[PDB]
Amino acid sequence: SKKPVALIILDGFALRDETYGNAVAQANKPNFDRYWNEYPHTTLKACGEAVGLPEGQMGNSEVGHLNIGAGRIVYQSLTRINIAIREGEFDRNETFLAAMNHVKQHGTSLHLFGLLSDGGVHSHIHHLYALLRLAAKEGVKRVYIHGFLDGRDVGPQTAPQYIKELQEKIKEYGVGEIATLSGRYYSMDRDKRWDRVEKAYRAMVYGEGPTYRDPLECIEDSYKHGIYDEFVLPSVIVREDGRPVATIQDNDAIIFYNFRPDRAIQISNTFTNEDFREFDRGPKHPKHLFFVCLTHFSETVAGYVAFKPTNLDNTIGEVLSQHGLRQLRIAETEKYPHVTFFMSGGREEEFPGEDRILINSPKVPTYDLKPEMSAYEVTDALLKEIEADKYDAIILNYANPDMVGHSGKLEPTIKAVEAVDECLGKVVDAILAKGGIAIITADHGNADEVLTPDGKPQTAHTTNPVPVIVTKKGIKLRDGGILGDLAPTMLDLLGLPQPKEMTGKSLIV
Ligand SMILES: O=C(O)[C@@H](CO)OP(=O)(O)O
Numbered sequence: 144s145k146k147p148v149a150l151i152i153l154d155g156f157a158l159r160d161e162t163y164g165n166a167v168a169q170a171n172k173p174n175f176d177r178y179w180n181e182y183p184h185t186t187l188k189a190c191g192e193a194v195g196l197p198e199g200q201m202g203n204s205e206v207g208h209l210n211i212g213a214g215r216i217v218y219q220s221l222t223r224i225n226i227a228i229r230e231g232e233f234d235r236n237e238t239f240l241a242a243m244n245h246v247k248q249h250g251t252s253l254h255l256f257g258l259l260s261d262g263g264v265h266s267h268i269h270h271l272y273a274l275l276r277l278a279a280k281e282g283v284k285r286v287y288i289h290g291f292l293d294g295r296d297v298g299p300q301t302a303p304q305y306i307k308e309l310q311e312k313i314k315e316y317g318v319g320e321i322a323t324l325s326g327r328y329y330s331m332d333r334d335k336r337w338d339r340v341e342k343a344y345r346a347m348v349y350g351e352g353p354t355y356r357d358p359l360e361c362i363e364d365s366y367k368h369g370i371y372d373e374f375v376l377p378s379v380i381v382r383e384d385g386r387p388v389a390t391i392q393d394n395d396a397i398i399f400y401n402f403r404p405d406r407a408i409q410i411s412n413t414f415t416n417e418d419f420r421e422f423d424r425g426p427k428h429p430k431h432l433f434f435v436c437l438t439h440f441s442e443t444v445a446g447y448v449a450f451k452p453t454n455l456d457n458t459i460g461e462v463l464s465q466h467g468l469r470q471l472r473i474a475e476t477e478k479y480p481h482v483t484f485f486m487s488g489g490r491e492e493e494f495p496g497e498d499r500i501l502i503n504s505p506k507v508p509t510y511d512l513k514p515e516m517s518a519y520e521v522t523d524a525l526l527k528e529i530e531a532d533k534y535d536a537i538i539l540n541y542a543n544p545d546m547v548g549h550s551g552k553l554e555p556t557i558k559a560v561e562a563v564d565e566c567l568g569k570v571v572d573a574i575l576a577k578g579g580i581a582i583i584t585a586d587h588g589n590a591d592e593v594l595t596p597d598g599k600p601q602t603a604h605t606t607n608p609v610p611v612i613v614t615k616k617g618i619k620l621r622d623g624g625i626l627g628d629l630a631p632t633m634l635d636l637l638g639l640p641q642p643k644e645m646t647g648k649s650l651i652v
């Protein structure tokens with residue numbers, strides 16, 4: 144029957160010479176190793192300008208899957224917004240100004256919330272500073288900040304430095320007050336764990352949660368309990384009289400300064416949806432909010448977008464569809480948005496002929512508790528589909544290296560990589576058995592460095608290059624490639640014409 148071409152993404156799996164804290168290098172990977180030694184291979188740049196990001200900026204699943212599916216260097220939001228600030232266009236943004244005019248004309252308050260760090264994956268604290276400076280320029284009197292603590296795109300216990308700098312900027316600009324602090328685990332969930340979302344929501348709307356007069360004492364107290372940045376319980380900063388600094392009320396305006404959509408949709412829907420059934424927001428939840436999303440999150444969000452989206456035409460999924468091929472997207476919960484929405488160029492709707500399989504990730508708080516996650520279930524489901532001779536193209540993502548690597552724990556991440564290697568062998572061998580070809584690669588690093596040189600947890604991504612193995616004998620792969628060269632390579636193998644929009648180039652010499 145069909146000789147499928149499968150694009151296999153080992154999420155957060157990069158190549159790094161240094162072996163200290165390197166779960167990728169330390170893991171026993173007999174399958175990956177044999178494919179690497181027996182088939183044509185190379186490495187690709189997955190960071191910085193090569194993927195549409197600022198120089199030196201590490202990649203991530205959004206950036207990576209967008210570039211992989213697009214077959215071209217995809218200009219990223221971080222870069223775009225940084226340039227708007229650099230060129231003096233940020234302050235002229237009609238949406239930001241409308242939000243500020245709203246609060247001034249109706250005598251309400253402006254709330255700013257988002258990830259509080261310079262990680263650059265979901266936000267950048269300098270964008271928050273630009274918004275504070277703009278609010279001051281426009282004469283907005285009441286501005287409240289609801290900080291979402293990081294520890295995932297930066298050090299696990301770095302919140303104090305960001306809070307301190309924010310406090311300095313607030314004093315310098317003469318506007319702003321920190322109202323709440325919440326770990327991104329609660330305020331930025333993407334797994335439909337509504338109990339987590341509700342906690343963040345109630346801290347911001349009802350002033351419910353651990354209370355502190357001093358933001359730094361809130362963090363220190365959490366640390367004393369072994370609860371670091373990412374997991375800080377939604378907390379409420381209170382005034383001298385004990386009342387919350389600020390709760391979100393009717394007719395207020397909100398600017399969510401996150402520019403990556405996957406972790407912003409849930410809390411945004413909670414605030415803007417007329418009909419919300421995931422949980423009872425309470426008869427007195429805020430209504431008539433002027434809600435601003437820094438970038439496009441979802442059509443379901445009743446708000447305004449500051450930096451409008453632009454369609455990515457002729458991405459891999461569209462080309463496959465146009466040529467009448469059947470394609471399958473598959474991954475477990477954690478990377479399902481990436482093999483679907485992001486891979487499709489920032490499009491939720493499936494292309495004609497595109498099927499999707501979602502495998503539920505395990506019900507554990509952190510994945511170091513179950514390194515194998517649901518990889519075996521993903522593999523079992525895919526093997527059945529391959530056996531059925533249904534798909535011409537397959538896009539599979541194994542979330543493990545990345546998801547467990549974010550724990551900053553060496554042994555668990557090694558187990559995650561080894562589990563994925565076992566699954567990789569079954570999938571690739573099955574594909575080869577069908578006369579097909581596999582393109583084994585990754586979207587960015589993570590598991591390659593889960594410990595800092597001093598032995599402490601390294602919970603974020605790395606800037607190391609990703610591997611690429613094409614399981615086809617008799618060919619050679621050129622070096623110096625980028626993520627945007629993968630789609631052209633896949634089309635090359637499928638014998639399909641490459642669209643003009645794909646400025647990337649096939650890796651096959
Ligand atoms: O978990 C996330 O949202 C990011 C880190 O902020 O990681 P990844 O890009 O792998 O999804």
Ligand SMILES: [Mn+2]
Binds near residue numbers: 154155203205586
């Ligand atoms: Mn990833």
Ligand SMILES: [Mn+2]
Binds near residue numbers: 545546549589
């Ligand atoms: Mn990651």
